[PDB]
Amino acid sequence: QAMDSYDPEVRVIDNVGVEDEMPNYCFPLSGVQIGNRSHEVQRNQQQWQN
Amino acid sequence: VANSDNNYIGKGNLPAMEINLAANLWRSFLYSNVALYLPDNLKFTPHNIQL
């Protein structure tokens, strides 16, 4: 005893739309997207040396 | 090996990006259903637009 049925939202398509106001932005495993390296730099007298 | 230089072999695990679907859905729900209906005294007009 399982009455045949159709999904009411499938029979009549109530195209209310999508509640998409917020973007999503899938992010990489690493939090900073590992790439080229950089050198630490400190000022010694007036210029910048590595 | 002769004329066998068209391989596209990678190393390690597959590259990918996380998206955290559960919090994405939940935060979109709260924004679009509660934050948008906040009283006008808690909403700001964006810059460089006229109302």
> Please, which experimental method was used?
cryo-EM
Q: What is the C-alpha separation between A32 and A28, in angstroms, rounded?
A: 8
| Closest of B46, B25, B49, B29 to residue B37, by C-alpha | B29
A28, B2, B11, B14 from B7: Cα distances, Å: 26, 13, 13, 17
DSSP of A1-45: -------HHHHS---------S----EESSTT---S-----EESS
DSSP of B13-51: SPP-EE--HHHHHHHHHHHHHTGGGS-GGG--PPTT---
What residue in A sits closest to B14 (Cα-Cα)?
Answer: A29
CA angle B25, B29, B34 (to 5 degrees): 160
To which H or E segment does residue A48 belong?
strand A48-49
Q: Which residue has the tokens 């000022």?
A: A43
Q: What is the C-alpha separation between A40 and B45, in angstroms, rounded?
A: 42
- CB burial of B4-38 (b: ≥16 within 10 Å; e: otherwise) equals eeeeeeeeeeeeeeeeeeeeeeeebeeeeeeeeee
Which residue type sits at B28?
A: S
Q: What is the C-alpha separation between B43 and A19, in angstroms, rounded?
A: 19
Resolution of the structure in the document, Å: 3.3
Are B18 and A19 inside 8 Å of each other by CB? no
Q: Which residues of A touch B19 (CB under 8 A)?
A: 24-27
- Nearest Cβ partner for A28 among B17, B27, B31: B17
